[PDB]
Symmetry: D2
Subunit: 213 residues, 4 copies
Amino acid sequence: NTDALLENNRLYAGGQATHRPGHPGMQPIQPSRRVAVVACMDARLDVEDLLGLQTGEAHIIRNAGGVINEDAIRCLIISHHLLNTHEIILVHHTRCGMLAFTDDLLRAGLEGDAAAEKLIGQATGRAFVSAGKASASPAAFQAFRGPPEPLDAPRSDASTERIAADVRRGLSIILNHPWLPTAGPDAITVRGFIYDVDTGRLEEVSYPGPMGG
Amino acid sequence: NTDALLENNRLYAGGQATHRPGHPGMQPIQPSRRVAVVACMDARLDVEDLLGLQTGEAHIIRNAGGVINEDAIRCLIISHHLLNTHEIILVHHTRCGMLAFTDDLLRAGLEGDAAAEKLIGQATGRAFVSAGKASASPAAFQAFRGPPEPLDAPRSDASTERIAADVRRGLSIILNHPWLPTAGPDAITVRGFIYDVDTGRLEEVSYPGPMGG
Amino acid sequence: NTDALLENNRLYAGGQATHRPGHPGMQPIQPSRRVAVVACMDARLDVEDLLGLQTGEAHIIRNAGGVINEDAIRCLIISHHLLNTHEIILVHHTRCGMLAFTDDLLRAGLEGDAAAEKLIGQATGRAFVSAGKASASPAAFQAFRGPPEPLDAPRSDASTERIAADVRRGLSIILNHPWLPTAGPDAITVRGFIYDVDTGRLEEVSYPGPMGG
Amino acid sequence: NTDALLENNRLYAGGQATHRPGHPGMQPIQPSRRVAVVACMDARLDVEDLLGLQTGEAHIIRNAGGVINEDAIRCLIISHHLLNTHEIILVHHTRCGMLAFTDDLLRAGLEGDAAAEKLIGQATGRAFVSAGKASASPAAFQAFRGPPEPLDAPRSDASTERIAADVRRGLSIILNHPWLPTAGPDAITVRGFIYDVDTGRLEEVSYPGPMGG
Ligand code: NA
Ligand code: NA
Ligand SMILES: [Zn+2]
Ligand SMILES: [Zn+2]
Ligand SMILES: [Zn+2]
Ligand SMILES: [Zn+2]
């Protein structure tokens, strides 16, 4: 499945769509390609479109960054163990917001630190307003490791490697989690990619490799 | 935005698509409709298609059930506070897998309880295989409250109310979380729906109302 | 260390204390017995007293039930990897509150379900008052598997086995977590017990064995 | 209760113990002083001893740092709503390990980054060994905000303020959590302190005040 979807993505990047946007009618719950995709929530990604999936074929799991966190694992456990998927595709992407802030800055700005509140407005170009109270949850915002770049900055090699390292960490989480079988007769397989939002083209991340530093 | 998307969904249910499935070219990170959607990962939902969103217009957050958990809140905090969205749409759906199991059954089957392992195979129609070890994470699978129905069962009033109660709980979480402003000049608004996978049509959930029992 | 502490606990159960309750003066951060204990927060447990530990000798991690959850693992990772402990002792106990409710009842009563609110008052003997709103966090209360017994009920074999199964699940979590070494030169060892609050005596839980059903 | 415990702590710091270290015999589950204490797991704290609590009087919740995270809130919800406590005491402490590392360094060293692995050995004085795989959980180690000081360093004003800010964040979490009542007839009250491990004496943290930056 994954190589056919990469060919659909080549077409997509070149200006030819493959996803059919109408309602498919009645379908069974099990994704028919036995695939789960974990991608960023970024509005510039339409995961079915950029892979040429059709409605009904894959679970589509999306969160800020496409990070493999506890919820992503919850989703993948359900997807495989209950709903029979056995392939996972990770789609991080270029110009991701998770490159542009740190957990501590956003936490301090929500808590009410006046400096952090102002700095978040300067980083985002919007009128960020502190909540003025602390919260235990979310315990982590899961910004990519490293110091921030400008929000929505053009590509750079440094940026690409930060995104790739986060993909590799997610591959390692999946390939080492006690409740996801990634070897043996019940095994799931996984591959990870970066979607370039401006070209439309996926590039694959190497694995094993560095996982964020 | 939300009422125009409901009209696109009326068209979609009736067999007329609105989403354009090609790559839109270069776009800014801020979703242009200032909307975030939280939906289930179920393969039968293509969120952009069923709402007639275009690529670039909304954050698309998807997890098993479309539940508002810690990760969903992480996503919504980033979406609003960093990326300027101010409207949220919840899309649960009919025939959801989260109606068809309990946390304890899946946990016990992954841990290695032989009875639970067999019962999960009987509930799913697949060869579920225990991992044979415990895990602290995920701490909760977030199955909808109540005893299970058959996987992918036809609609029923009881089912609909179980799904609706989970939507109302998610609306209440958003409307009471310390770090999401839902009143005042920085406020976010929210509405919740159930997508019927067989008709293609959304129906709105009342709020306030019961939140699961 | 653990067998000497069991002898101190034999003395404790028989009416002879071993812990010295005065301030020990200046001490280094590394626990001098290289032990971490995870126990319930129940007021009837004084962990240093019931094991005859002295101040300075062990990390003392305590939560509702003594459950091995994400925070317990966070604590144990720090305890071993940063602070050089290499032995873990689990102390669950009899008459634990985690035998006396379910996650769903407490969640529904906090959300505002009128039935659940009344039932929690009847189970607890106090005037439980709903918060009247939902929360994403805590995602799980981690009540022991199975239907509730009366709060603070006398011992029973069924109760003991429910507590033991939760201990075994915690041993399995520790012995299978990616970030706790429990084999090789950096290994940690672990044993699990039930403290009888009325006799003062520990009893050891078998492992491997059933982990909750 | 809290002021009487501070007088017991004055005695404790001066060399006079108050906690009785023998088994108290049969007791009810509800803590008799209606108090919950959240403290660090640091071996140099014996919470009952340093407050002069007796066995049976208070819930004792302990984790790395005494941080108010999701598990601490789970514990406090159970403590109050089920078990009738209505006062909370926070006890952070001097020379805490949570001042001496960052989340990212420990995460990268567990994942296998060779630089981080070596740097953690240099910070801890022990042979830290990487696990060589990533994990989604624990999602956060909850080190105190700011750059690390040496492990187990002597007191400093900067250190004290870092610890105090973490106490204030925990007070704010408790005083703003949807499921802890801290006003009205079911209200809980809370105060926060720093325990000096070398003198034995508590000092109280001001609130409201800065919550970490
Ligand atoms: Na789509
Ligand atoms: Na003690
Ligand atoms: Zn992104
Ligand atoms: Zn679903
Ligand atoms: Zn207990
Ligand atoms: Zn500490």
